[PDB]
Every structure is written in C-alpha cells, then in structure tokens.
Amino acid sequence: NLYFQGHMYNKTVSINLDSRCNASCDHCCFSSSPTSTTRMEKEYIRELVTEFAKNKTIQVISFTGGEVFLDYKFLKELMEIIKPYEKQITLISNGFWGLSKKKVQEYFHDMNSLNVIALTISYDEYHAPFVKSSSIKNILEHSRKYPDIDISLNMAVTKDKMSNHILEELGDSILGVKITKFPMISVGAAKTRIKQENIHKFYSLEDEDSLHCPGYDIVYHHDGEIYPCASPAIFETKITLREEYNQSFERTVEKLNSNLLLFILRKEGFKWFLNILKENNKIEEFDIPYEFSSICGVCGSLFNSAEKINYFYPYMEKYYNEN
Template identity: 25%
Template structure:
C-alpha cells in the first residue's frame, strides 16, 4: 500500500454536534493529539517517501489552536503540503478571521470550511464568508464543504439530483442514527460494493489521537504508535483482511453474510449497512473496529 497523504484527526472534540457527522463529533468527545504525537507521526511520514501532504481535521482542530498552528508549521518545515478542515466557528468577523489565519501565512497551503444547514442556519454562513475573505487576503487557498439535507436526494441513487456544490450524506456514525430514517431505504442485498473508499490503494488514511490508522473511519489497520506506518502498509493485504476483504468481494452485504449476520430489510445506503454490520462485529474484531469514539460510545 502506497500512501500519498495523512489526515490527522487532531481531536474528536467539536463545538458542534451535527446530525450528519460520521465521527460523532461533539463537545463531549475525548481524545486529542499532543505535540509529541504529531512529531512522531511526521517522523514516520518522512520514512514513507510517497507521502506528500499532511492535513489536520477533527472534530474541530481550531479548538486546540496552539497545537494546530505548531503542527502545521512542523509539517511545512519538513516540506509537506499542508491543509486544515474546519467549521469556521472562529471567523466571527473578517478582522477576527485575519487574526486567526495570519499566523498560518506561508505555511498553510489550503483550508476547507464546512458550511451548510447542518452547521449553520444558512447554507453559506457569515463565518464561512469571513474566512474566505481573510484567506484570500493572506493568499491561502480556501474551499467549502457543503452537505445536502436528506430531502435533497443524498442517497447514492440520487447523487445526480443534488444541488450544485453539495455532497451527499454518508449514513454512518451519527448520520446513521439520526438521519437514515428520513430517506427511503433500499434492499440490503443490493449493497454489493463500497462506493467511496479505495480499499486496496487508499492514497490517504486518517490517523487519530490514539494512533489508530483508519482506511475508512472506524476500520483501523493498526496502531502507528505500536507498529510504524511503513510496516502497517507493507503487511496490509486487502483481500485477506477480515473487514476489507469482505467489502472488496461483495460490499457491506458480503460483510454481513460472511459473518452470519441478519440485516433488516432496507438501509439508506451502503454506509448505513456497513455501519450496522461493523457495530454487530465489534466484539469479534475489537482491535480493528475501533475506537469507541468512532462508534458514538463517549
């Protein structure tokens, strides 16, 4: 497995608690990276020459601003492309947004700001607009992440109906618990492929504060604080892995059948079925389907 990017989940904590969040982000979540852990991750990334980019996400990474800032600076000093994903809560005015972003000038390559009706009471929030204006002035690339409401056709089969610039919901995590019942389900046996992740060569993986390396959120390939990234990549066999192997050979439906599960009749999308199956299988694969934070067990 050849990686090109690492997305660091700086924290599971978030000042928001959005219904669509597949990480169960909330003010009550626990788990935050230390600077020592970030340095260790960057050190390991240097030994994997195909890794070119380091992104900081959450939760909400700006909640731990000094650590986020230092992490970006350290990554940039080592020659990595850098990026941040944020909800932009801090951009209460353009002047304030400039103060938050100015220390990143010259080290931060890009920032993605979430803005939609899950985060704010308007699609393009004033915070998002303030962040965009400040980023433009500082020469930092900024883009928006907007997730459509279930009524806008965010099931897989309705992606073509989504408003321009919007992405559909993935019904996993809190979205599976809160939103799946708002869409018409499809027969569980129809979900015979993973539509979102390249499980053989993912390119990028997520690393959380506990060192878990996620090929998809909640499916860990190993703990990098126990086994280095290079070794995890070298030993990973997608076909024989107990979770990805099933997903590759028949999607979430195969994951359920192979493990003797009895799904309900219909599910909102492939992620919804996969989320349900993985929850059922956690006792059996506790070192893979981890940590509790990914499954809403706060």
C-alpha cells in the same frame, strides 16, 4: 529502475487531532462537543507529525477533528514541524473563527505560508446553531485573496434539512467555491437524533453492480486507532490497522497492503461479502439493512462487529488458498 509498483496508499495520511469541538451538531459521527475527552496525547501527535514530515512517500498531510482551529496554537505548531520538509497540508473546519476578521486575516496568512493547499468549510442546518452565516461569508470572501488555496463548502443534509436557505443567505461569497451536499451516515449522533425516514436512501442490496469501495486513505484517529479510510462509517467497524502503540507508518502501510479482508473488498467488491450472507440466509440474523445512503453504510453494516468479521474468516481463507 527494475522495480514495479510496491505498496499503495502511502502518499497521503490524515490525523484526527481531537474529538473536542465548539459545536454540538445533531448529526456528528463522533458526537463532538466542548466536553468531548477522546484524543491522543499532544506529544504522541507531535511524534506522528514529525515522522510523516520526514517520510519519503507522504506528499499530503490532512488534519481533522473535532474542530482543528479550536486549539490553533497546537495546529500551527504541527504545521511548522512540517514546513522544512515541504509537505502539502489540507484542513477542514466549521469556520467558527470567521466571526473575527483579525483571525481570518492571520489564519489565511499562516495557511498560505505553511503550504495549506486546501481548506474545506462545513456549513449546513446542523452547523448553523453554532456558527453564524456572516462568519462563513467572511472566510469565503477573504479566500479570494489566496487563489492557491482550494476552497470547498461541504453541507451535510437530510430530507427535512436540505440547506436551501443556507446557500441563499451566503449570497455571492460562494462564487467560484465547490459546493457538495451529501447525505447522512447513520453513526454517532445521527443514529439517535435524526429520524431514519429523513436519511436519503440511494443504494439497495439488489444493486451490487455499483457497490465498490471509493478507495483507502490512512487515518490516525482520536481514539488511538488507525483506519483504512476517512468515512464516518469506518470508525464504527472492527477494521483497524494498529497492532501496537509505537507503530511506524511503513508498518501501517504494510498492514493495509497485506490485509486479506481489505484485499478481497477492493478486488471483488461488496457483492463477494453480500452473496455469502444471502447464500447462507444471514441477512436478517446480522440485521443488515436493505437500503443505504452510501456505499460506506453497506461497509459499516458488514463489519461493525467481531461476530460479522469472524463469520467471513473460512470464506476468506478459502479464497486465499484458491488464489
């Protein structure tokens, strides 16, 4: 009462628990593998989760990696910290644990009792050498006993690997499951292990009309930085929200809401930045591609270096003085 909308982006948060994974996908934006060492400390993650659970605005806490079910003991401990505070939880997994019917029974029982409202399973031709089809089927079939857990199947595809046979092999286990096939973002292992010809190109620089950011969503990443979104493309940029080791979530939200570059991006769209480079003939100097698989790819190539961000500084400063 007597207050209008304050800060945005404070209802959800994501934590990337670790870069370690059982799989070594050739497209992995983080080049994840069993030998990946990039991660925040366990006690630091416990403090973060405790703070997010006690926070009055956060409604949803999401966990990602890496493979979050790889160290299940630690994942269940984090979920039990949240439990007395009744926050909703979302999980994403490669479903390696589907190989064991005992783990399938136990994990669904735990997710249901720990307020896990959504589980996304990632399966495609890039994941297929590391996880069997029957493991995915066991998870999808058992999810029918837990209708309150929203189940999704995310498939990362290329022109040569469209996952048509993968989806057929899953049989009727996909009935009622939301399936989304998405193109690659040229970051991490996809940059060097996938032919760029095989990456779908849906956007071009000439269609600035439809180039707007899908929306911010705070991520506390395994590199110890904080990002304004969960897109694979953002982790390659110099856009971070961390100023110190012990930063509060209220401070992260305040920084996101006062960041001038991100305010201009949300309000004016990508055309504001692209027209500044076109007007000053800098598209070739900054090696900005002409075609992209996603709007995030444009974002990635506009701010993936300090030279590029610093270039926009006088224009953003001029925008601030005018408005």
